[PDB]
Amino acid sequence: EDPQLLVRVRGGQLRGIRLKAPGGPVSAFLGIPFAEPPVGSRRFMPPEPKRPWSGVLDATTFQNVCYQYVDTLYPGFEGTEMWNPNRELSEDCLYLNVWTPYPRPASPTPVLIWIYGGGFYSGAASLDVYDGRFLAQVEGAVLVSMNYRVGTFGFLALPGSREAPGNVGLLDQRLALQWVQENIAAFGGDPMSVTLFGESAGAASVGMHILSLPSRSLFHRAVLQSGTPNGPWATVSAGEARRRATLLARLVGCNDTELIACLRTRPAQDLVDHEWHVLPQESIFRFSFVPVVDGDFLSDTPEALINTGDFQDLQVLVGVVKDEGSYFLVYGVPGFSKDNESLISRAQFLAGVRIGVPQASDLAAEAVVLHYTDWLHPEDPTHLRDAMSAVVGDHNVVCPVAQLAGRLAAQGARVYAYIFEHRASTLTWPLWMGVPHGYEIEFIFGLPLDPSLNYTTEERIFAQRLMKYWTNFARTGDPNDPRDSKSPQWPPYTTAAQQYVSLNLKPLEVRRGLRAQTCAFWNRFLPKLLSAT
Amino acid sequence: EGREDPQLLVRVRGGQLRGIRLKAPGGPVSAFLGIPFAEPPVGSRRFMPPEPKRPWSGVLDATTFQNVCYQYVDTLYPGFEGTEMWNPNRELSEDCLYLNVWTPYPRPASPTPVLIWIYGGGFYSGAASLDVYDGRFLAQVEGAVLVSMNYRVGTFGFLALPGSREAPGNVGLLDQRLALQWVQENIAAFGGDPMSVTLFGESAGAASVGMHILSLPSRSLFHRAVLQSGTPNGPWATVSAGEARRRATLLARLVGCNDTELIACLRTRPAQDLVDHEWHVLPQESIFRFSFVPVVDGDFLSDTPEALINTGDFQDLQVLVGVVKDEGSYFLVYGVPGFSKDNESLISRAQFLAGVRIGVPQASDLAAEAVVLHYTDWLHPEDPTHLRDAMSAVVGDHNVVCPVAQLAGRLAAQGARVYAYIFEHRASTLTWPLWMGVPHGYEIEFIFGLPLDPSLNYTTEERIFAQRLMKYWTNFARTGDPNDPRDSKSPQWPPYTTAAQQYVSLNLKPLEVRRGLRAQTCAFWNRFLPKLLSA
């Protein structure tokens, strides 16, 4: 029996499986329990450490996916399906996955920990795009990913109550990080060099761990892909979370203790049935149960915390894809569809703005329309369509990212920023969506290295470059190859020069200012506007 | 009579005139200067509408410029040419309603298209007798009949106690209208065609031309109009009835004064006493603000210019409108701390923020914030060169470029034929510093063709350029189209339309067609800012 597949952690023995990567084998250990199944009276409660087990626990397969809403917009279309659960749903879902080189690392290896996105309402560490074997095989990394509770199960909160304190889904992530500290050395991983990375809601989780003191002793560097703790969707106020929780309890037929108790008796799918019914306005890029400003996990709003934090010893890599907003238009904005070029009228554009910026007053919405209209072609359908995408991307991702990068840089952090501009040759969404939210992931994880995936040879070469930036950053806090000259170099993002790089098929190009003019509108003017109005 | 030049004697409705034979570079022209067109608006007539001049006897000598209307004289840079060239070059007087005529020599034997010039100077200053308004070159080279008139400015022209008989306001505009009527009646005696009259003017002169378009009684006195760097809409060209009354009673109080009693007391004040308090009645510390300007009286102006342009019918109107490259730079040295003609005026962020409040004096804190956010360069938010230029652009865009863009857009959409330009050439002889670029008012010397005078020290290219511009203006006056029908080879000047927003660059190089009159920024000024103000 393969001793490379046998490992002992604090809770007992594990049997892993030998997997094939194109360049060689890797050792994978999938479905490792890191917490007691958060079921029955455990629902909505913070996780508890997993009890020791007897014998050898079989970690050769992905465990269940946390209970969550499942997308049905385009039934059986690869573009949407690729994000849907690829295992059985269950509230018993608190398991993590570890990939390492085979044989396992001779000396302690830097650890990358992935945190998936999915708007805090969905996602799983088992998706094909999160496959860790490429990074493990090629860069000899130790890769870890966890499941964390999403939707009402992970983030339903009655702020101040003992039984539904909020943010338990982020506590799930934190326990997994504690697990890595306690156990990763047994896999050949270095607990003294841990890099968090995640995309969308995953990036925002990474950011919340930056901003939450108890998480800080569990990682050394961070990567935020297309997401931030700050911004309009990633957090809610205690007042608003309380509101949403008691509205959901009203819809399902339900003193905080009494209320939470009746919710605990509800079958999972009954809660999920009403997930989308509690949002205050018709919107897109807005999610019902997300992290809450509790005054505990988050001592203040992420805006306040990034504005005042001390980020001296801290390295961060942050970025965005070319078209953050395009994907979301087809999920609520009339006139948009994956099946046509979605050329919209001016009317549709104004209507669209109230949906993409749901919190906006008439006057603020007016300001947005007037800023994004191309007044040389105010009525041009192509311009109006692309502008609609840009409003959503900018408001939700690009400008929150520019704001974080800027505050981090000014307050002592080492920051590297990018924009990702390559569109996959295999993409099944329309051309008008360009490079949509989430389609850089498969390249960072190295999927193009698999011949059967039908990526182009240039895309393979490109994925390898990306894997190097990311693992080199994990190793050192600097994505630049250490013994390679001529590139040119990826420079740190600073407040003075605001340098970032474009990631694409051509060599790194250095640009200055991350939508500087347009993000000043979003981050400097709009707040002053709604502040009074 | 008897031994006079028979080509310099002419009769008009009021009597006989003797003009003078003037030398221009390419030959002689006839000038008739200092023709009275109204009764001297003096004494009991101060503040009153002008009365047509009563016939005189004998031959009136029309060989020299008459008095300049009483006005505030600029003392910012004593003895500096850049400021002096705009100051009164004849004695100041309330007896000042005279006009000038230039024609070819001998006078045209067939009826010639007429150009009428209205000077600017913020409605507080100006004179038709300044060097840069010399009609001799357009007369000689293009064969134009050129008229320019003096009109009352400042308090004498524009002090209004709206609703009163004795000071109804806008009398300076009524002066201009009277001259226009004079041209309709008398210009044929000079060989001018009264059925082809084109108005043109710059800054407040342009705003004036715009008021005549918007005021029905003037409409039958002209056929085409040119507005150079000014418009009747916008933030400086008019004041409400309420604001005019407020400024008038403050000034009265400042000199020690029922509207009849008040106006009567003002009529007893020395002209200079009124002028001395001109700038003391503006509501905020400002630049590109003038104390006494046309008022929305519900008479001359039946409503605000904004409402009138937005909703009027201009089907059979032909207009040429444009701006210079740096409308705002000139004004900064008259009020924005940190700006001088003697240094590079590299300012700090703080000076920019203070400057914006002065250059956009009617803006709330939030509106000001909006302005500062829009014009700030966020890659170089503290860079002094950028901030200097942005300050200039704030003032220029707010006061001229966007009101012009707004005017052109409404006129085009409402059936007018519109031609738009940006004038980008800086005179080789300009005495203002380089940082000011092509400042407000410095296209005028080219339109009038001063560079044709060798003694002025312009370049050969400037001479050729000036000739081109004279051709455009006179071609437009003649046909309502600045293009030469006998010259297809040269690039064409297309009309400005809402759909294509075309205009041309005027500089040393051939005509270049461009799209969008500062479209993105002007949307801010023209569409957003008003909506903000309604909140």
Ligand SMILES: O=C(COc1ccc(Cl)cc1Cl)Nc1ccc(CN2CCCCC2)cc1
């Ligand atoms: O945002 C939405 C909208 O969700 C819904 C709202 C209401 C209803 Cl009834 C129904 C629905 Cl579905 N869907 C969405 C957005 C992005 C992705 C892709 N993204 C997933 C995680 C990794 C990064 C890429 C998938 C679904």
Ligand SMILES: O=C(COc1ccc(Cl)cc1Cl)Nc1ccc(CN2CCCCC2)cc1
């Ligand atoms: O705007 C001003 C301000 O004037 C003043 C304000 C206050 C005081 Cl105390 C004192 C003063 Cl002076 N002056 C100004 C602007 C432009 C020109 C040039 N312009 C004149 C008309 C034709 C086109 C060019 C001359 C003076």
Ligand SMILES: *[C@@H]1O[C@H](CO)[C@@H](O)[C@H](O)[C@H]1NC(C)=O
């Ligand atoms: C595109 O298709 C969708 C769904 O079929 C439709 O609702 C929309 O109106 C279409 N858009 C255009 C511009 O035809």
Ligand SMILES: *[C@@H]1O[C@H](CO)[C@@H](O)[C@H](O)[C@H]1NC(C)=O
């Ligand atoms: C330019 O000079 C004037 C007076 O000489 C001064 O008041 C002003 O502050 C100077 N500006 C700068 C930017 O140095």
Ligand SMILES: *[C@@H]1O[C@H](CO)[C@@H](O)[C@H](O)[C@H]1NC(C)=O
């Ligand atoms: C033109 O140039 C000559 C030659 O230097 C000079 O003497 C004359 O004064 C100049 N005239 C003007 C108006 O600058």
